[PDB]
Amino acid sequence: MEFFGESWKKHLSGEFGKPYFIKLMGFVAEERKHYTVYPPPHQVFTWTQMCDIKDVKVVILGQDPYHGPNQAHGLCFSVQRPVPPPPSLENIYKELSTDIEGFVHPGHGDLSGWAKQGVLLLNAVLTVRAHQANSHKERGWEQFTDAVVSWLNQNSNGLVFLLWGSYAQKKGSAIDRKRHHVLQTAHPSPLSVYRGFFGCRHFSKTNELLQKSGKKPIDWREL
C-alpha cells in the first residue's frame, strides 16, 4: 500500500485483505487502466499523510471527490493552488470570516494547513472517474471510510465531528456522543447554506469543545 501514512496503516491495514477491499482495488485499477481517475494515485490517501492518526482532533466528513481537472487532492473541500475555491468552500470561508473574527480569505482553497493540525478532511468515496460525478460510489470506499470513522470513534477521545448535510450526518449517525462531540448543520453549498450553515459557528464551537478534553485549539487561520 503506497502513499498511505504509517500510523494509519498500522490500525487500518486489516481492511486491505477483506473481499470488499480487494474488489474495490481491482475496480479502481481497471478504471485507471483506461481512464483518468481523480485524485491521482499518490493523493488518494493525502488524509493519512498530513498528521498522525492519534493526532486527529476534528473530523469533517464529505461525500465524493471533486471530479474536475486538478481539483481533488485527497482532502474533502480542499483544492490545491492555483485552483479557485469551489462555491461550498467560499461559503466555509464566509462563515470563518464572521465566526473567527479577523480571519482573512487566504486567496486559495488548500486546506492542508488544517489537516496538519489534526483536522481530518475525509470524503466517504475516495476516487472518481474524471468528469463523471459520483462515478465510483457504492464500489467499496464507503465501507472503508466507515472503518476509519469507527476506529476513531472507538479509540480516540473527545473528537469533534462536523457533519454538514444529510449524507455526512448519516455517515456519523453512530458516533458515541458521550465520548465525542458532534455538531450538525446544513451543507455549505449555495442551495443549502442559508438553511443553517451561515451562523453555525462550528469553528469557534469546535475549539471550545476541544478544550474540554485538554486539546489545544485549531488555528483556523493557518492555511
Binding residues for dsDNA: 67, 88, 166, 187, 189, 192, 195
> Which amino acid would we find at residue 60?
I
The helix/strand/coil state of 14 is helix
41 DSSP assignment: G
Please give the Cα distance from 163 to 187 (Å, whole number): 8
Could you tell me the three cell numbers for 44? 488518494
> Which amino acid would we find at residue 26?
G
Could you list the active site residues? 64
Please write down the HEC assignment for all residues of 119-161. EEEEECCCCEECCCCCCCCCCCHHHHHHHHHHHHHHHCCCCEE
Q: What residues are designated binding site? A: 63, 67, 77, 88, 123, 166, 187, 189, 192, 195
* Closest by CA position to 166, among listed 194, 192, 139, 127: 192
Is residue 37 within 8 Å of residue 132, measured between CB atoms? no
* Closest by CA position to 196, among listed 219, 173, 220, 162: 162
